[PDB]
């Protein structure tokens, strides 16, 4: 009755950051030892909580957020961070309690053709609130004239495509990021360690 952490990390495909996937984990036993002791992670940063002391505590729910970003944008997946990813794609609250796990995925998500179907939000009039998902594909009106659905002057498509190429630098290489969030509400607990 172990929690399906393999589904999130050992996933064949990953979602774009603007349409980040979240898997609700509950009513299972979470064995973190199979996760935190792996040496395949480039960054394993935890805030507010310590993974070595998770096999003894309990939580009502656990969330795992999956997306693909650039190496330069892994810095933005952190509380109190600003940037295109942090403001318009995926925002973490300043009081975040959890971990952000990122590993390089150049072998998986890169193509010599110089393009891929990974997208991020480039234009947005206001920043995202924490744990907010905007999957709009409507033309961004940068002026006062209505866009009428056709891209043009002062009317741009809000999304942009990563140019993931195997020859790019480490900063440009695609990274797969999984964000573990722990929820504690006044309710029966459903996720406990071994």
């Amino acid at each position, epitope marked *: 009755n172990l929690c399906p952490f393999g589904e999130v990390f050992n996933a064949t495909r990953f979602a774009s950051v603007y349409a980040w996937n979240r898997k609700r984990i509950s009513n299972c036993v979470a064995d973190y030892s199979v996760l935190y002791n792996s040496a395949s992670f480039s960054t394993f940063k935890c805030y507010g909580v310590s993974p070595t002391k998770l096999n003894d505590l309990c939580f009502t729910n656990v969330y795992a957020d999956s997306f693909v970003i650039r190496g330069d944008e892994v810095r933005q997946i952190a509380p109190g961070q600003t940037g295109k990813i942090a403001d318009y794609n995926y925002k973490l609250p300043d009081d975040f309690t959890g971990c952000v796990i990122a590993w390089n995925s150049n072998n998986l998500d890169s193509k010599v053709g110089g393009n891929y179907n990974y997208l991020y939000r480039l234009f947005r009039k206001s*920043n995202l609130k924490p744990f907010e998902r905007d999957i709009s594909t409507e033309i961004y009106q940068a002026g006062s004239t209505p866009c009428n659905g056709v891209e043009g002057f002062n009317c741009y498509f809000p999304l942009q495509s990563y140019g993931f190429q195997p020859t790019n630098g480490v900063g440009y290489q695609p990274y797969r990021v999984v964000v573990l969030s722990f929820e504690l509400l006044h309710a029966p607990a459903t996720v406990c360690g071994p």
Partner: antibody
Amino acid sequence: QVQLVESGGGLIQPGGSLRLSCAASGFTVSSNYMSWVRQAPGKGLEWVSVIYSGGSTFYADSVKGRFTISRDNSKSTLYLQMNSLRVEDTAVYYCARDFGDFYFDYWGQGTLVTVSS
Amino acid sequence: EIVLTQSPGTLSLSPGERATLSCRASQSVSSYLAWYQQKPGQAPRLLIYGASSRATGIPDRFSGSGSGTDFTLTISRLEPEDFAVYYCQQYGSSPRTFGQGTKLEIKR
């Protein structure tokens, strides 16, 4: 049509403050990236600061902590607070419309700021 | 800090000739380069974005080529108004930086 007109440049003693205004036309300033670029009186272009469409502000290392970029939607004007000016800050400051923190598609006429005792 | 080195410092060509301008980078930017033209007394005007895509209102005689660390701006059939200082700007890494610029003069 897009117009960008700048104001607020002039002589100022070292350490004194100054504010540069940028009147904008043809687009909404609250929805576009906008940047300030300064060109030295003889040297090349240097990006100073940028304000995102969502309101985030980023500054260069040589101006961080001293320069503050701001916008007024009601007046459709871009601002740049200078605060602790230095002689090395003497340049012509340009107001440019930024396209997603990538490149500057439109530029203002530029205003000259001279900092010297 | 990533430095964009432009060559030559100044270029002298007659109208109607072909101008080739170079812009090399400290690191690879992978086509995240822009080209600007600045006539004396005026602000820079955008010419090329994406290191190959032409900005609106720019004649076909301006073309961008190259990727990674090597980039080229070519102007064919030079017109007397096409002579100014041309700067290349990279946007592949913060801070966004410009080159020294290449002066383009007519020849007599």
